[model samples]
Target: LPPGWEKRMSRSSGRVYYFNHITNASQWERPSEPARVRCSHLLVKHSQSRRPSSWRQEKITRTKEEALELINGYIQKIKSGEEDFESLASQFSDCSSAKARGDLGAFSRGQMQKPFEDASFALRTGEMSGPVFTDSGIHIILRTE
Candidate 1:
């Protein structure tokens, strides 16, 4: 399987379903030997809701101050070469992309949330940004594209 692709088991058929990408037309499959894939990101989304789609239910639920602080710590560590982005993302990120070490695959404009898209697009490759707040939550974004 390629990087950024995820597998889920269907309850009714007991079949494995594979999918890719965070936004737009991401690839998915159940190939015996999947093709190679690529991406550029290391994101930490701290949403108030457990369900990513439940953005409307909660009002005024912001990302915790402490969590934002922790993200800063990780940023410093990455800058100092004391920690790996992928490792930290896998351990801490709240998105499914965490399984791929926070790789969101490739996303175009208007594909992601406005705030996330703004923050992500403004970055240069290998540059990591501080907390970016959106309806989804606070995101510590790293641009690899």
Candidate 2:
């Protein structure tokens, strides 16, 4: 599927809106990247959350290799896929994005910090980007893009 176009079916309460699930393709190209999907009961309404002052963009490192090393270091001594998402994110993530369980949700261009915007859109759905540092910290992101 093309990036960012998702068929979202949802339910809302006052200001909070919930979605049934989000499905996207995986980024594992060698394994033949297939669709990777996740469902959340709370995709909440955050129309009011501004980009926090600390949420400024950073200079890109020039290579994905550099970015990969940073994220791997954070997962040091911990088995990848062995730890739970929240446990890992809480200890590593530096953005309010973690408030949605590492879910940054659908965003229009420019809404995100630049390094994040660059890495994320480069990915296929269900893919991950970063540990790309920002004024925030290492962001190990998963995308529904």
Candidate 3:
């Protein structure tokens, strides 16, 4: 089942055909991903990341292992729902967006690097994704609107 479609499969000689048995929304050319997605995210960079030095740190010498560890812990804290995402990100994230509490506003396909964009698009509203890696860094995206 898709967002607005209930799908049924028909296996012919070719195998694996699909039809929307019911749909409240009619999509002319069902988009592979949504048109746009809004999100807030935290990024962690390692020495291996492209242009490793970020706004918050110079000569980022941390290993990918360390970055992954931090991202993993942050996600767990967010999952606990104990602290506000904004509060945690304002103090925790090392990306340029941290000034705005890690908010990236809204963007469409190709605007962002593949991993970050796909992770953002994959989430439902209010859902936070696990760590996503890009050339820049590791990210934890919270799909907002």
- At residue 123, what lDDT does model 1 achieve? 50
lDDT of 2 at 88: 56
> What is the per-residue lDDT of model 2 for residues 1-145, given as tens digits with 9 covering 90 to 100?
3433333333342332222112222222222222333311111111122332222223322234443464565444233666655565544443545456666556655666676555555555655542444544345555565
lDDT of each: 0.57, 0.42, 0.74
- Note the residue pairs that clash in candidate 1: none
Task: Please give the TM-score that candidate 1 achieves against the real structure.
Answer: 0.58
Superposed model 2: Cα runs more than 4 Å off: 1-70, 74-79
Model 3: pairs clashing at backbone N, Cα or C within 3 Å: none
Query: What is the alpha-carbon lDDT for the whole of candidate 1?
Result: 0.57
What RMSD does each model have against the real structure? 17.1, 15.0, 9.5
Model 1 over residues 4-77: C-alpha lDDT tens digits?
A: 34677767777777543332111125533112222344444444534443222233344566656776788778
Question: What is the TM-score (0 to 1) of candidate 2?
Answer: 0.45
* Each candidate's clash count: 0, 0, 0
Candidate 2 has an lDDT of 0.42
The TM-score obtained by model 3 is 0.75
